[PDB]
């Protein structure tokens, strides 16, 4: 059996909290660690191929204009950065529709109403609230077990399929709710080591 001393030494590495993560993130070491990981990956950019050989030049210019207006590079860099900072990040693709209950049904590629894609937003974890259905909580055999079906952001509950969720190292199931169904934060991984290094340097 695990000894009591080792057991409560390991158990004490609990979830510090989103407020604690945000407060600690001001430090330079943790900021740099969360920053220059996906930023370097995003530096070189990407290229578009499609089924065809080359996209038509007007389409390519339109894509470039829309990407510049949506600031995709900055959004994905910030996505990775704050995904490292907190345990989980939520990216919601804003789009307009007549139905005021639009963000209630599962996401469908047909429900477009063309010329409606206005951009994307990123919601911090403390501004959101995961919501689990009985079908997503009763059956361990279900592939959506302990996967939040809805996320209450501002009153309304956005569906899981509508938004893109990037999470940390995905803790085990018994203590997944302890992380608010997110991930293990790199701030929790390095708020003691960073302090020790800085105090020794001091």
């Amino acid at each position: 059996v695990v000894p009591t001393m080792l057991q409560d030494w390991y158990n004490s590495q609990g979830f510090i909290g989103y407020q604690a993560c945000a407060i600690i993130s001001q430090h330079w070491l943790v900021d740099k660690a969360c920053s220059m990981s996906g930023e370097d990956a995003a530096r070189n950019g990407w290229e578009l191929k499609s089924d065809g050989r080359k996209l038509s030049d007007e389409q390519s210019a339109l894509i470039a204009r829309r990407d510049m207006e949506f600031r995709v590079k900055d959004n994905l860099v910030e996505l990775n950065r704050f995904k490292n900072v907190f345990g989980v990040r939520i990216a919601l693709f804003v789009v307009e529709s007549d139905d005021p209950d639009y963000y209630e049904k599962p996401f469908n590629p047909d429900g477009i109403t063309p010329g409606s894609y206005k951009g994307i937003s990123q919601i911090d974890p403390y501004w959101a609230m995961p919501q689990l259905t009985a079908g997503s909580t009763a059956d361990p055999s279900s592939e959506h077990f302990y996967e939040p079906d809805f996320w209450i952001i501002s009153g309304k509950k956005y569906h899981r399929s509508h938004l893109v969720v990037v999470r940390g190292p995905q803790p085990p199931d018994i203590l997944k709710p302890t992380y608010i169904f997110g991930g293990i934060p790199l701030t929790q991984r390095i708020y003691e080591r960073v302090y020790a290094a800085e105090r020794t340097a001091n």
């Binding site: 020790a196 290094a197 105090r199 020794t200």
Partner: protein, 117 residues
Amino acid sequence: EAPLLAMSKRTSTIHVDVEKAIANEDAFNARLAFWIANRDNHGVKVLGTDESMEQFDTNLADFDSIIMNQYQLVAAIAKTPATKLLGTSPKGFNATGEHETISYHEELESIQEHIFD
């Protein structure tokens, strides 16, 4: 254990006549608090006869070998190079080479691929 002991590395102690110190015990504490506040390597401390003020310090040069030996053993159980886990080769160990790259990239990863299969 190296940072935490490095915090209490130096342990200077002063031999004051305590039965005299208790008699006032406010001015004495105020004076020594003033000394500790404005401690500097140019100021001089006056202390009477029958007073020693010795100083002790700890040697911490050998903690690095212990730390990196234990991290190397962590890599040993993990079957993963210390370059992959610790981010680099540990203290004093030979630089990682072709033998370790073929031991990790080819052996364990092919095992994981046959597990995935």
